[model samples]
Target: MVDKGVKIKVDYIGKLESGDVFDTSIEEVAKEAGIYAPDREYEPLEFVVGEGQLIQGFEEAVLDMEVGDEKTVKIPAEKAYGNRNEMLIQKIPRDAFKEADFEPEEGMVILAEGIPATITEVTDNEVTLDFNHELAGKDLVFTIKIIEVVE
Candidate 1:
């Protein structure tokens, strides 16, 4: 049985509720979902269980699985990336961009204080940036196959 601190190999396809696959470690699933990247290599994912290497729901799901087991699960937004917070959407003076040597533009992502933020609006006076994670507020679905559990 998988448990905390156990090493394991897993193959998984992660998709949105709308059925758009966002990631996968299996090549066939990537091709089937029309998200295959020819230049990217695919392989089983390896991680230590309950080590924060995977999302909360994904880790919990794996803990209930055994080697050679396959299952599909839907994780709520709160358990996946959590809900988006309006507080993370902030308006900063445009001078901050100039001081950072950056030209702020709508839809541009930047790292401020080591946190990633997306520019939502750029105005003469202020720049609106969203600091929430891109996947926040989105539920995730995963088809997982537990390949092996290391001792």
Candidate 2:
């Protein structure tokens, strides 16, 4: 259901349990995130809405909404990024990067095994990284609405 040129109209805000905002789809999202594109104010991001360009939990949460209707939907980790798997976390030796010039810092996200990985911790000898999505194992809340619906 993806559409060209963001023809759909809606507003949404994504937040974490601690109320830390992760992202949003309206001007608010771009504003709070400090994304200042001159066209952002005039054009809203559009898609089929439930067409999977957005997350499933968010799309499912917005089904059957009216143009002016708004609702808050809470999505558990299981439904969002699924669960965090210990197997996905791998430990690599610091010596592995002796040739490559890159800084590995704690909480830094890296691409390991062709998957997006986050550096959870780094020791003198080894670095621990998780390949799970940033949202994995975390609950999310979505405040959304269908500002415009069209056939």
Candidate 3:
């Protein structure tokens, strides 16, 4: 059985509610899902159990499985990335971009107060930035297979 200090290797495919894959450890799976990157190397993920190296629900799910086990689990938004916070969306004066010698675009991401924010809307007066994570408010489905257990 896997325990807190166990090191395990796993292969997983993570998908959204639309059945579109968002992440995967297998290179072939990423290629089939149209998310493969030539510069990115895909392989089984290695992590220590209960080390906060994986998401809450995902880690718990893997901890319950034995070596060579395969399972699929649906993780709620709360257990995944959590819900988006509207308070993190703010409109900053357009002058801020001018001072930074940059023009804000609708899809641009910027660092504001050391926090990364995505530009949702850009107007002459202000730029609307969303600090919420891109995966926030999304439920995640994952099919995971345990490959190796190294203690």
Candidate 4:
């Protein structure tokens, strides 16, 4: 049996409420989450399980898992990305776009070293952008299997 703080090998399929896959296969998600090294390549992450090393939703999803067991779970906004912060929306003057390659528009996703930041709104005098995660306030799904219980 898998126990808290034990390492495990797991395969998971993560999708948005619309069933749009955000991540497929354990390796991709582990890399995107920064839990493993780039050269490790196609191996289960070896961190202490049930720890805050990964998001709570992901850790909780695998709690008590057994090898060969599979389950699908829904993670809510609060448990996953949390609600969007209204204060993250900032109204910056359009002049800010003078240095950019293109005019910023509503729903445009900005990035800082490849990190996601969405443009929530826009106007002539001001451009309102949200620095919160795009998935904030959305429900997500995960189908996972415990390939091995390494503990």
Q: What is the C-alpha lDDT profile of model 2 across 1-151, one tens digit per residue?
A: 2232233466777777876566666665666766535675623445465355666676666665656666678678877777777777877787765446655667767775557566686776767777776577777877776677653
**Can you write out model 3's per-residue Cα lDDT over 1-151, one digit (the tens) per residue?**
4767887888878888877778888888899898888889888897677577767677778888888787678777777776766887877899978687678878677774656567788887888877776456657887777888885
- Candidate 2: minimum summed lDDT over ten consecutive residues — where? 1-10
Reference-based lDDT, each prediction: 0.78, 0.65, 0.78, 0.65
Best-fitting candidate, measured by TM-score? 1
- Model 2: how far residue 135 lies from native, Å: 1.1
Write the residue-wise lDDT of candidate 4 on 1-151 in tens digits: 4556787777766677886656545766655655435566554543346565544666677775677666677677777776676766666677787577647788877866654456667776667767766567666786666787664
Candidate 1 per-residue lDDT, tens place, 19-63, comes to 777788888888998877868876889767767777778878888
lDDT of 4: 0.65
Which is superior by TM-score, 1 or 4?
Answer: 1
Candidate 3: residue pairs that collide:
none
RMSD of 2: 5.9
Candidate 3: misplaced stretches above 4 Å? 85-88, 94-128
- Which pairs of residues collide in candidate 1? none
Ranking by TM-score: 1, 3, 4, 2
